[PDB]
Scaffold this active site. Structure first.
Site, PDB file in Angstrom:
ATOM      1  CG  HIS A  17      -1.969  -1.727   1.667  1.00  0.00           C
ATOM      2  ND1 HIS A  17      -2.006  -1.214   0.014  1.00  0.00           N
ATOM      3  CD2 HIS A  17      -2.179  -1.963   2.598  1.00  0.00           C
ATOM      4  CE1 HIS A  17      -3.548  -2.571   0.515  1.00  0.00           C
ATOM      5  NE2 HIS A  17      -2.828  -3.260   1.705  1.00  0.00           N
ATOM      6  CG  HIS A 131      -5.557  -5.612   8.070  1.00  0.00           C
ATOM      7  ND1 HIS A 131      -4.373  -6.488   6.839  1.00  0.00           N
ATOM      8  CD2 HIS A 131      -4.953  -6.298   9.295  1.00  0.00           C
ATOM      9  CE1 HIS A 131      -4.162  -7.793   7.729  1.00  0.00           C
ATOM     10  NE2 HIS A 131      -4.859  -7.172   8.971  1.00  0.00           N
TER      11      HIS A 131
END
Length: 136
Positions: A17, A131
């Site tokens: 990410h 996450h």
């Protein structure tokens, strides 16, 4: 969710990410997919720094929209630039041939954070993102 064994969750978060190794999704996704041994259907890269996400982990705790029994999520406060990569061309027996579209946007994000891995995460960051729960 699963990761390759050589990564902590925070390291994998950064790989999936944060470290967009090319501004082009097809190229950037090769990394993630080579590690996961599959072509991911969708993935978001946040155009922000790891340090900035760590600081978002310091924002008030909130319920995770994707895993409602969890309260380790944190809202970004502000919108950030990001890029969504979406699989256009599967190739499960030859991952290198997967192709992606990409969609730029400016959006809020919600991250799940945890205490670092004792053995393998650097003591620099006691609390780390693990996450990407939601984009909004």
């Amino acid at each position: 969710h699963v990761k390759p064994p050589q990564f902590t969750w925070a390291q994998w978060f950064e790989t999936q990410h944060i470290n967009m190794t090319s501004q082009q999704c097809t190229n950037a996704m090769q990394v993630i997919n080579n590690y996961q041994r599959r072509c991911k259907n969708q993935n978001t890269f946040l155009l922000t720094t790891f340090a900035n996400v760590v600081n978002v982990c310091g924002n008030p705790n909130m319920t995770c929209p994707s895993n409602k029994t969890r309260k380790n999520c944190h809202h970004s406060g502000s919108q950030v630039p990001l890029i969504h990569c979406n699989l256009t061309t599967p190739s499960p027996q030859n991952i290198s041939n997967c192709r992606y579209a990409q969609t730029p946007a400016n959006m809020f994000y919600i991250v799940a954070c945890d205490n670092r891995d004792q053995r393998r995460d650097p003591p620099q960051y006691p609390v780390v993102p693990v996450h990407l729960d939601r984009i909004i």
